[PDB]
Ligand binder design. Structure first.
Ligand code: DEQ
Lengths: 186, 186
């Protein structure tokens, strides 16, 4: 598939290299596609990017739901999600690329556009977990939406800023975090 | 000095045109130095940059030493340091060159190694706050080294992946997080 070929080489390079490091030229030489290809469903570069992001976001959200069963209580769901957040092959491996992409477009107003609906899925997982926990009486969070955002970002941090040290060490930290966070919620 | 002069000019250059565009040539001519002297001092642009980064870490620490006086108890220092981390990077010029540099050299262990020694220094702050916090019964943490790395990275998370939100909101979420976290240690 050509339309689904660009997306392939793209995600690949955006991960190995940064947002800038990888260029349209490089994709075209490994995916074979003139300017045209990139225009109907692939306008700009930040377009082909915001695309990949959504795909991955869904790939992750899906995997999460197909695996959250191994967790009976929401307290366990919180812990798990965070741990999985470290093992996955979806979305998280593009955080560095995102950090860049943002530090180099936070001017073009059409940024907080997708950067919005995207920030939703990103925190939705926590939103449910937290609200459901309220119903299930595991805790009582009145500012769910906030805690959701905080948890989501703190976790992204532990996943992103320690991406080079022993995976077991990581898993250990993340769990000690999840333990400390939930415990500060009541 | 002439070394100090290269670092100076280099910091500015990096700040004005980023890491990738700054050429050692520019650095050499503007610092009124020479390819040879610049080689003898840093060997490479990457090292030159890491060196600036080190000096920068120093200023940060020194600054934090003055600023933490406004914080009597360790609980307070935790709160302060976090907010500070968020607000100061909002308008930290080098930030862009750093993002660029990291998301382009974390592949190499040579460089990644040195960078971790740097990130460590950041973490030390939290280690001190937590250790002292123990000795004052503000809390009881027996795995300081861990809690420290965790805090550190969670905070980097909230600082990095939120940029796109009203500055106050960001500060609010941060302070909330410091509240939740600090409470889950009791
Ligand atoms: C003076 C001074 C003054 C201030 N007001 C100040 C304010 C805020 C922060 C530093 C400040 N400093 C000095 C700051 C010196 C900082 C040296 C930092 C070295 C480390 C970066 C590590 N890193 C890692 C590990 C992993 C990542 N995925 C990653 C992704 C994107 C970007 C960086 C990444």
């Amino acid at each position: 598939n050509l339309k689904d070929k660009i997306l392939g080489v793209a995600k690949e390079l955006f991960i190995k290299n940064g947002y800038n490091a990888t260029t349209t030229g490089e994709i075209v030489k490994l995916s074979e596609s003139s300017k045209g290809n990139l225009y109907y469903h692939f306008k700009t570069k930040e377009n082909l990017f915001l695309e990949i992001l959504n795909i991955e976001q869904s790939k992750w959200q899906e995997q999460w739901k197909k695996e959250q069963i191994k967790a009976k209580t929401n307290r366990e769901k919180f812990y798990l999600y965070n741990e999985l957040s470290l093992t996955t092959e979806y979305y998280y491996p593009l955080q560095n690329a995102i950090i860049e992409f943002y530090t180099e477009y936070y001017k073009t107003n059409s940024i907080n556009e997708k950067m919005n609906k995207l920030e939703n899925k990103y925190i939705d997982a926590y939103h449910v977990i937290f609200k459901e926990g309220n119903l299930n009486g595991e805790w009582s969070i009145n500012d769910v939406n906030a805690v959701s955002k905080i948890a989501a970002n703190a976790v992204n941090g532990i996943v992103t800023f320690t991406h080079e040290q022993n995976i077991n060490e990581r898993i250990k930290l993340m769990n000690k975090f999840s333990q400390i966070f939930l415990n500060g919620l009541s």
